Ligand binder design. Structure first.
Ligand SMILES: *[C@@H]1O[C@H](CO)[C@@H](O)[C@H](O)[C@H]1NC(C)=O
Ligand SMILES: *[C@@H]1O[C@H](CO)[C@@H](O)[C@H](O)[C@H]1NC(C)=O
Lengths: 108, 108
């Protein structure tokens, strides 16, 4: 079986300023494939690769390979701000690609 | 010194269908920081992380840490197609971030 993303994954969310929000990507049959979290933006921002956050460890947290099956990948956006509004995706390096996207709406 | 991107890096380019095109990111003072190449799209696509292409090794090639200074990172897009049009960025996990973007125009 190829990797698939179990649903619900990457559910859209809303938040007030300062609230913490999680996006969860649950991957079935990941095997040796890699998971990356990205924010859609111009330019986009890599947020995590495999088991490590790319940068800003106090802003983004990644709990990779958790859950009962070691197959839940939870990205936390801490202290949400207006600049965090937008679309977050988790993507797996399959051919063809496998991905799931959800929106963060920020209320002031 | 923090990482910086030497200019010219990530120069815009044009191509006919089937042509190969390179984007080069030349990083001064990279240290232990990581380089990622991303395509802006909805959703964006991670193309490479550190020294390895994310996926589609026959489509994207990465020559990481080449040049005289071992500080040129060259991403090749092989066999350019209409779907390859858009903005390619290299980004380094500094705080704050360091990045450079160039456009690929595809002619039919
Ligand atoms: C996120 O993507 C949806 C399409 O799935 C789009 O309608 C929405 O505007 C995007 N959110 C942004 C750009 O903040
Ligand atoms: C790439 O980004 C530039 C802004 O720097 C924008 O004008 C252009 O439309 C983009 N190219 C696309 C979306 O193909």
């Amino acid at each position: 079986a190829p990797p698939t993303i179990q649903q619900p994954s990457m559910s859209s969310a809303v938040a007030l300023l300062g609230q913490d929000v999680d996006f969860t990507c649950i991957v079935n049959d990941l095997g040796s494939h890699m998971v990356a979290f990205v924010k859609a933006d111009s330019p986009p921002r890599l947020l995590s690769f495999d088991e490590k956050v790319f940068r800003r460890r106090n802003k983004y947290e990644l709990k990779p390979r958790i859950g009962d099956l070691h197959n839940e990948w939870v990205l936390t956006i801490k202290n949400v701000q207006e600049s965090d509004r937008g679309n977050y995706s988790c993507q797996i390096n399959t051919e063809p690609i496998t991905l799931s996207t959800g929106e963060l709406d920020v209320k002031v």
